């Protein structure tokens, strides 16, 4: 039977070349005798180039291949939460089967143009620099980009951790389920990752799709789609979901590897002509639906690894061009003490304030502005043998505001805590304080109001802004704390 | 089964079997040769013809020559009787001391440990090297990588670690030389012996050795690491011990593959590499790992072609490490050895929660100032130093002294430095830097800080220099 | 003060000019590396 089954003509470098299979559809899952699956990516006149999902040691010339008739779909829904699954949705945390009812297809088209509405609900990270100057809204696609080891995955993690404030809450329209896709990473990193998340009690609301370093190319390829589907189940059901693709750089490599082995034509950097289309069809599935559709959302934090800061290399160019903004991390900043290494001047949020809270805006706005102003003069500092007090002023606001954007890891803040601290320097209170102390000030200052003043923060929170009152109360709280502070 | 050779082109040999086609990865032995020639099956070309990679020279092979399927991937003698010995890609002793009488044999090809087999303990592994320890601490059972272009210190650094760590280590050690210099395996073997890590008279050997040097055909080079790694996995799993794995240089495994790649009929990926580089590296790097059964502490030297860290190979390897020591010819060029780049070296344990805040604040303190100085370098270059704020000409000072205090005379490079090797303890390091950063030596001269161990030697050296 | 003013006017203007040139040199180089790296891949692929 050459219609529903085929015979392997040759097998190598994970590409199977099957004879027969006359009825297979493009991208169909097929099965080799040995039990290994494969996906038909090249339907040629005289053969099927099949992408083997595993070790090609188990396939020989002549092995019989049969069709499944089924296209790639994966488990989905609420039972995956707190689980560690492979790219096919299989459980790899050895905790037992995932009790999944619904199964969704991994590659589906993004919701069209009509079914959506402007991104308007804040997606809070807990990171002041991001939350005040590179705001993410639900349904937005914001890229975290930077060289190796700059703090990229940390941003995502702090972000995931942060959602417990709302996941332990009652308001079900503020909860955000998290999905973390690990592509090309080593297993020890993910293990370490899931640990950090368990320790913070964030695994309860997180799903981990993992396609690691030793998993065949095709699984690394798929991973992001199969994780996307999982997040779509939430989006579609009036629920909100967050997805982190770590990294899109490694998946591009996986895809390039199959493309070239199937012999498709190579373009710049050896990438196939459809590499742009591989990510665009992925990153567009993230969106903010309309109430007519459930008002549910899917926010995506895709990671791209640049090289020597070459944001214009091929893949970094595509993805930058596809997403709504970028958080640019930099080594120089990192080693200079700015952690997280966000380059505030080049980072962006097309969505902008349409996603900031009124509380934040109340402060974010002047901060954004003195910083931009400092950035103009900063370089002068170190040779400012005699600058006027006009600009000498902006250098001072400059370094203090900058110290306020600093942040340790695993400790995401509540929007109310961020504005209280930002207010402190923005209003001028730390202007006479020593740069070397702002980190210590904030820490203790924030410890104090989180202890003693939970009623003002609750106000700020509730009233959503800084009332003329709470404004006055903060003035005293900081002018007395500061006095205390320099005793 | 018996196949015949149909084509020979370099390290690649195509074989035609009449009945029974040997599976991919199977090792075949060429009949009619003074020495054992193993061919690893690489592909099924179809028409009952397999394409294979030779594990040795292909000279004198003839079209039609006979080849027997051994029925299994390359399998080597694994076990304790490998210790103190020197093996081949294919498991043959190459030390002239007779057979290796192991109870068992293992195939060099195997699946990597599952996700549920991973471990996450993180213990700093002190080495005695100021720079590493201070800024990019190694971790027991972790994956370590020494990156460097030709001749910047990868091997010497591996040499001083064998001395400062392998030597006291209570457990085995496996040193796999992959595509490196033959002269070097002879230097190390004889050093192991002169120091009793290798014992030729008794069973006190604490190190097994495996070699596939630069004088070998691509094939051997594409597999020795596997052989080496396989020996190490035995002590990890079947004995459950604490292993120390040294590989110099893992880049050679990847260069080996790129060298036959075209003869395997593949469109090249970027920079000439083969399109399967990352996956080829992945299925290997994923076995070099600590599990719940045993622990591996791998120190891998990683060559950097053209000195370009973005080269697909060095570039693809960062993700497999928990700590990285990046060496730089720009630093070396100044006479600063070890030439580690303080701003490009990292460790997963550089966490206040793991090494402590004193350790952490010093490290980051040292890095800020070196960064601060890096930025000014290009500028005082042209505009000079007068206009600089006393605040800023002090960081130039301290930086230049730290830059030096980071160098150290290794005990394995006296032939190089003309200085006795010093091993500094973690607290002597943290403290020394803490004080320089604190302004406590702004009076001593930079030179006093160059090529010395502990901070006291910098103070003594100041006097000696005092005239 | 009039000579430092003058000297620093020039220096600053030379700098900017240097900036404009290095930038243009950067883009020419950036384009040639990509083109160069791509022709190399094509040559290898076509020879097969």
């Amino acid at each position: 039977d050459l219609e529903e089954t085929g015979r392997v003509l040759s097998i190598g470098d994970g590409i199977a070349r099957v004879h027969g299979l006359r009825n297979v559809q493009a991208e169909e899952m097929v099965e080799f005798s040995s039990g290994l699956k494969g996906m038909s990516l090249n339907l040629e006149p005289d053969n099927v180039g099949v992408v083997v999902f595993g070790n090609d040691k188990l396939i020989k010339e002549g092995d019989i291949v049969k069709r499944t008739g089924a296209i790639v779909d994966v488990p989905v829904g609420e039972e995956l939460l707190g689980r560690v699954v492979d790219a096919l949705g299989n459980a790899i945390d050895g905790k037992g089967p995932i009790g999944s009812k619904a199964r969704r297809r991994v590659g589906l088209k993004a919701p069209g143009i009509i079914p959506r509405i402007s991104v308007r609900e804040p997606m809070q990270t807990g990171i002041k620099a991001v939350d005040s100057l590179v705001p993410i809204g639900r349904g937005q696609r914001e890229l975290i980009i930077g060289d190796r080891q700059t703090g990229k995955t940390s941003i995502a993690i702090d972000t995931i951790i942060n959602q417990k404030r709302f996941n332990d809450g009652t308001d079900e329209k503020k909860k955000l389920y998290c999905i973390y896709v690990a592509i090309g990473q080593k297993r020890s990193t993910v293990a370490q990752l899931v640990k950090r998340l368990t320790d913070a009690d964030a695994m309860k609301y997180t799903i981990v799709v993992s396609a690691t370093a030793s998993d065949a190319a095709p699984l690394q390829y798929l991973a992001p789609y199969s994780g996307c589907s999982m997040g779509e189940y939430f989006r579609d059901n009036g629920k909100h979901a967050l997805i982190i693709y770590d990294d899109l750089s490694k998946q591009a490599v996986a895809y390039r590897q199959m493309s070239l082995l199937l012999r498709r034509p190579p373009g710049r950097e050896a990438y196939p002509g459809d590499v742009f289309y591989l990510h665009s069809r992925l990153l567009e599935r993230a969106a903010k639906m309309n109430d007519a559709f459930g008002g549910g959302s899917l926010t995506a934090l895709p990671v791209i690894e640049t090289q020597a800061g070459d944001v214009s290399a091929y893949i970094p160019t595509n993805v930058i061009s596809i997403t709504d903004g970028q958080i640019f991390l930099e080594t120089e900043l990192f080693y200079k003490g700015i952690r997280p290494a966000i380059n505030v001047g080049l980072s962006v949020s097309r969505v902008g304030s349409a996603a900031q809270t009124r509380a934040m805006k109340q402060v974010a706005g002047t901060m954004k502005l003195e910083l931009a102003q400092y950035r103009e003069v900063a370089a002068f500092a170190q040779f400012g043998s005699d600058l006027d007090a006009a600009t000498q002023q902006l250098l001072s606001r400059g370094v203090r505001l900058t110290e306020l954007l600093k942040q340790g890891q695993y400790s995401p803040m509540a929007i109310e805590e961020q504005v209280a601290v930002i207010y402190a320097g923005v209003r001028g209170y730390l202007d006479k304080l020593e740069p070397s102390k702002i980190t210590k000030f904030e820490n203790a200052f924030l410890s104090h109001v989180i202890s003693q003043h939970q009623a003002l923060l609750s106000k700020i929170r509730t009233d959503g802004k800084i009332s003329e009152e709470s404004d006055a109360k903060l003035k005293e709280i900081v002018t007395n704390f500061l006095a205390g502070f320099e005793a | 089964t018996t196949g015949r050779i149909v084509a020979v082109i370099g390290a690649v040999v195509d074989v035609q079997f009449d009945e029974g086609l040997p599976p991919i990865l199977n090792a075949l032995e060429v009949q009619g040769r003074e020495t054992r020639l193993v061919l690893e099956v690489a592909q099924h070309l179809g028409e009952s013809t397999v394409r294979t990679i030779a594990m040795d020279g292909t000279e004198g092979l003839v079209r039609g020559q006979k080849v027997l399927d051994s029925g299994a991937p390359i399998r080597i003698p694994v076990g304790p009787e490998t210790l103190g010995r020197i093996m081949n890609v294919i498991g043959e002793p190459i030390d002239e001391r007779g057979p290796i009488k192991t109870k068992q044999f293992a195939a060099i090809h195997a699946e990597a440990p599952e996700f549920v087999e991973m471990s996450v303990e993180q213990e700093i592994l002190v080495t005695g090297i100021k720079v590493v320890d201070l800024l990019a601490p190694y971790a027991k059972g972790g994956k370590i990588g020494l990156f460097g272009g030709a001749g910047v210190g990868k091997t010497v650094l591996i040499m001083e670690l064998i001395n400062n760590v392998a030597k006291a280590h209570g457990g085995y050690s496996v040193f796999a030389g992959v595509g490196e210099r033959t002269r070097e395996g002879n230097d190390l073997y004889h050093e192991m012996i002169e120091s009793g890590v290798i014992n030729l008279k008794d069973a006190t050997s604490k190190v097994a050795l495996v070699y596939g040097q630069m004088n070998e055909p691509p094939g051997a080079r594409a597999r020795v690491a596997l052989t080496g790694l396989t020996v190490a996995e035995y002590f990890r799993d079947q004995e459950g011990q604490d292993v120390l794995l040294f590989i110099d240089n893992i880049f050679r495994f990847t260069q080996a593959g790129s060298e036959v790649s075209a003869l395997l009929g593949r469109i090249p990926s970027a920079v000439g590499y083969q399109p399967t580089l990352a996956t080829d590296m992945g299925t290997m790097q994923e076995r070099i790992t600590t599990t719940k059964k045993g622990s591996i502490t791998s120190v891998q030297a990683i060559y950097v072609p053209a000195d370009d860290l973005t080269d697909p190979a060095p570039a693809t390897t960062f993700a497999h490490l928990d700590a990285t020591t990046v060496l730089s010819r720009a630093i070396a060029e100044l006479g600063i050895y070890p030439a580690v780049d303080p701003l490009d070296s990292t460790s997963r344990i550089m966490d206040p929660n793991i090494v402590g805040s004193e350790h952490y604040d010093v490290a980051r303190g040292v890095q800020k100032i070196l960064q601060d100085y890096k930025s000014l370098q290009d500028i005082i270059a042209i505009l000079g130093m007068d206009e600089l704020s006393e605040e800023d000409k002090l960081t130039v000072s301290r930086a230049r002294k730290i830059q030096r205090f980071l160098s150290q005379p290794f005990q394995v490079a006296e032939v190089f430095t003309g200085h006795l090797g010093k091993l500094v303890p973690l607290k002597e390091t943290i403290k020394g830097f803490q004080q320089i950063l604190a302004g406590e030596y702004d009076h001593l001269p930079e030179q006093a800080f160059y090529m010395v161990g502990p901070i006291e030697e910098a103070v003594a050296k100041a006097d000696k220099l005092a005239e | 003060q009039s000579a430092r003013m003058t000297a620093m006017d020039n220096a600053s203007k030379n700098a900017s000019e240097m900036i404009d040139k290095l930038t243009l040199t950067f883009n020419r180089t950036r384009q040639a590396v990509i083109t160069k790296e791509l022709i190399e891949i094509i040559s290898g692929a076509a020879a097969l």
């Binding site: 800061g309 370089a379 | - | 180089t29």
Partner: peptide, 25 residues
């Protein structure tokens, strides 16, 4: 002509220009 070096030079000249324009005024 290395995109690395070129960038290294641009880095130090943009600062020079800045400090130098300041000194002029």
């Amino acid at each position: 002509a290395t995109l690395k070096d070129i960038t290294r030079r641009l880095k130090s000249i943009k600062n020079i220009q800045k400090i130098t324009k300041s000194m002029k005024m």
